[PDB]
Structure 1
Amino acid sequence: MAGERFPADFVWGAATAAYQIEGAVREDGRGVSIWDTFSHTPGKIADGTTGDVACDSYHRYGEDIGLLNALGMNAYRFSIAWPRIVPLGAGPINQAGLDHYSRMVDALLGAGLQPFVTLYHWDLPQPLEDRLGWGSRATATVFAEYADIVVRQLGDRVTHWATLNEPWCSAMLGYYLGVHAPGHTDLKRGLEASHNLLLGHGLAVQAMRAAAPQPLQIGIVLNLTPTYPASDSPEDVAAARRFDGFVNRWFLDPLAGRGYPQDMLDYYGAAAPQANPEDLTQIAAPLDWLGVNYYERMRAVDAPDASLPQAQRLDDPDLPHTADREVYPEGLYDILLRLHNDYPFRPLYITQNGCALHDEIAEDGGIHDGQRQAFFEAHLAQLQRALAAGVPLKGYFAWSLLDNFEWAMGLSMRYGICYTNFETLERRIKDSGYWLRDFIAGQ
Structure 2
Amino acid sequence: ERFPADFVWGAATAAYQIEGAVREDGRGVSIWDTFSHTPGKIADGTTGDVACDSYHRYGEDIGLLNALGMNAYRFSIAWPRIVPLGAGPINQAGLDHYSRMVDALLGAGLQPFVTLYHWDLPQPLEDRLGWGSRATATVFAEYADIVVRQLGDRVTHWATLNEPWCSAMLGYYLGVHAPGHTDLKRGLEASHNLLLGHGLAVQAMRAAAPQPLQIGIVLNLTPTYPASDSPEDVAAARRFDGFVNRWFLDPLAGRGYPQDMLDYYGAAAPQANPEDLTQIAAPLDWLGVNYYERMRAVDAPDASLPQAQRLDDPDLPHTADREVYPEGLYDILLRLHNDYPFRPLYITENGCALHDEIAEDGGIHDGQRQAFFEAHLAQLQRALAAGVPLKGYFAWSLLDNFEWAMGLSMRYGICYTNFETLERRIKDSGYWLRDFIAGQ
TM-score range, shorter chain: over 0.9
Aligned partners of 1:22, 1:315: CA distance in 2, in Å? 36
Match of 1:422 in 2: 419
Provide Cα deviations, 1:207-236, integer angstroms capped at 9, x if missing partner: 000000000000000000000011111111
Aligned partners of 1:171, 1:328: CA distance in 2, in Å? 26
Of 339, 342, 353, which residue of structure 2 is paired with 1:342? 339
Aligned partners of 1:133, 1:378: CA distance in 2, in Å? 39
Aligned partners of 2:225, 2:92: CA distance in 1, in Å? 48
Provide Cα deviations, 1:7-51, integer angstroms capped at 9, x if missing partner: 000000000000000000000000000000000000000000000
Secondary structure of 2:73 counterpart: strand
Of 168, 174, 177, which residue of structure 1 is paired with 2:165? 168
Secondary structure of 2:263 counterpart: helix
Cα distance, 1:145 vs structure 2: 0.1
Cα distance, 1:270 vs structure 2: 1.3
Aligned partners of 2:235, 2:12: CA distance in 1, in Å? 35
Matched, 1:144 2:138: no
Aligned partners of 2:24, 2:11: CA distance in 1, in Å? 26
Secondary structure of 2:62 counterpart: helix
Secondary structure of 1:54 counterpart: coil
Provide Cα deviations, 1:172-226, integer angstroms capped at 9, x if missing partner: 0000000000000000000000000000000000000000000000000000000
Aligned partners of 2:89, 2:364: CA distance in 1, in Å? 45
Matched, 1:212 2:209: yes
Match of 1:14 in 2: 11
Match of 1:120 in 2: 117
Aligned partners of 1:320, 1:347: CA distance in 2, in Å? 31
Secondary structure of 1:127 counterpart: helix
Cα distance, 1:441 vs structure 2: 0.2
Cα distance, 1:90 vs structure 2: 0.2
Of 278, 282, 285, which residue of structure 2 is paired with 1:281? 278
Secondary structure of 1:410 counterpart: helix
Secondary structure of 1:395 counterpart: strand
Secondary structure of 2:377 counterpart: helix
Matched, 1:363 2:369: no
Secondary structure of 1:103 counterpart: helix
Aligned partners of 1:307, 1:407: CA distance in 2, in Å? 23
Aligned partners of 1:411, 1:274: CA distance in 2, in Å? 38
Aligned partners of 1:229, 1:184: CA distance in 2, in Å? 30
Matched, 1:372 2:366: no
Of 253, 257, 261, which residue of structure 1 is paired with 2:258? 261
Cα distance, 1:69 vs structure 2: 0.1
Aligned partners of 1:138, 1:334: CA distance in 2, in Å? 37
Aligned partners of 1:401, 1:140: CA distance in 2, in Å? 30
Aligned partners of 1:216, 1:61: CA distance in 2, in Å? 25
Aligned partners of 1:225, 1:93: CA distance in 2, in Å? 37
Secondary structure of 2:166 counterpart: helix
Provide Cα deviations, 1:144-197, integer angstroms capped at 9, x if missing partner: 000000000000000000000000000000000000000000000000000000
Aligned partners of 1:372, 1:71: CA distance in 2, in Å? 16
Cα distance, 1:422 vs structure 2: 0.1
Provide Cα deviations, 1:365-392, integer angstroms capped at 9, x if missing partner: 0000000000000000000000000000
Cα distance, 1:53 vs structure 2: 0.0
Provide Cα deviations, 1:355-410, integer angstroms capped at 9, x if missing partner: 00000100000000000000000000000000000000000000000000000000
Match of 1:330 in 2: 327
Aligned partners of 1:274, 1:57: CA distance in 2, in Å? 40
The alignment's TM-score, normalised by the length of structure 1, stands at: 0.99
Secondary structure of 1:222 counterpart: strand
- % identical aligned pairs: 100
Of 81, 103, 106, which residue of structure 2 is paired with 1:106? 103
Cα distance, 1:415 vs structure 2: 0.1
Matched, 1:403 2:428: no
Cα distance, 1:256 vs structure 2: 0.1
The alignment's TM-score, normalised by the length of structure 2, stands at: 1.00
Provide Cα deviations, 1:294-316, integer angstroms capped at 9, x if missing partner: 00000001110011000001111
Provide Cα deviations, 1:298-338, integer angstroms capped at 9, x if missing partner: 00011100110000011111101000000000000000000
Gaps of 5+ in 1: none
Provide Cα deviations, 1:41-74, integer angstroms capped at 9, x if missing partner: 0000000000000000000000000000000000
Aligned partners of 2:49, 2:310: CA distance in 1, in Å? 34
Provide Cα deviations, 1:277-309, integer angstroms capped at 9, x if missing partner: 000000000000000000000000111001100
Aligned partners of 1:48, 1:313: CA distance in 2, in Å? 29
Aligned partners of 1:85, 1:53: CA distance in 2, in Å? 19
Provide Cα deviations, 1:110-149, integer angstroms capped at 9, x if missing partner: 0000000000000000000000000000000000000000
Cα distance, 1:274 vs structure 2: 1.8
Aligned partners of 1:16, 1:382: CA distance in 2, in Å? 23
Aligned partners of 1:298, 1:166: CA distance in 2, in Å? 17
Cα distance, 1:352 vs structure 2: 0.3
Aligned partners of 2:208, 2:423: CA distance in 1, in Å? 39
Provide Cα deviations, 1:391-440, integer angstroms capped at 9, x if missing partner: 00000000000000000000000000000000000000000000000000
Aligned partners of 1:180, 1:269: CA distance in 2, in Å? 25
Aligned partners of 1:25, 1:52: CA distance in 2, in Å? 6
Match of 2:79 in 1: 82
Match of 1:316 in 2: 313
Aligned partners of 1:115, 1:409: CA distance in 2, in Å? 27
